[PDB]
Nucleic acid binder design. Structure first.
Length: 44
DNA sequence: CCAGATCGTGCGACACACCGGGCCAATTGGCCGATGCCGTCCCGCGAACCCCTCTACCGTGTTGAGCAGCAGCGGCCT
């Protein structure tokens, strides 16, 4: 808690590092597969 | 002295006083009935009016003064 919240948010967002193209593609594939599995679970 | 103003009195006219008759003028004022133009409304289409949606070279950091409470520290006490 500080009188300035912009600095707090800025310093908070930087903890997570960046990502590369292959990582992005792998994450997208994970999202797709997870949602399709969720739909399959929705099936009875 | 005696003669006109004032008034008494008299005769007439007479402008209406009555209270009652017998008709009339003017002037209606309603809408009667018939005819006609405007208000309202129900679409009809179209101009605009507002809302929602999407674009893939990429790109990764904003004074002074007065009064009171809290944090750090010196120094007993165990």
């Amino acid at each position: 808690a500080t009188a300035d919240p912009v600095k707090d948010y800025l310093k908070q967002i930087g903890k997570v590092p960046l990502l590369n193209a292959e990582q992005e593609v792998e994450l997208a594939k994970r999202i797709e597969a997870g949602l399709f599995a969720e739909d399959k679970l929705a099936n009875s």
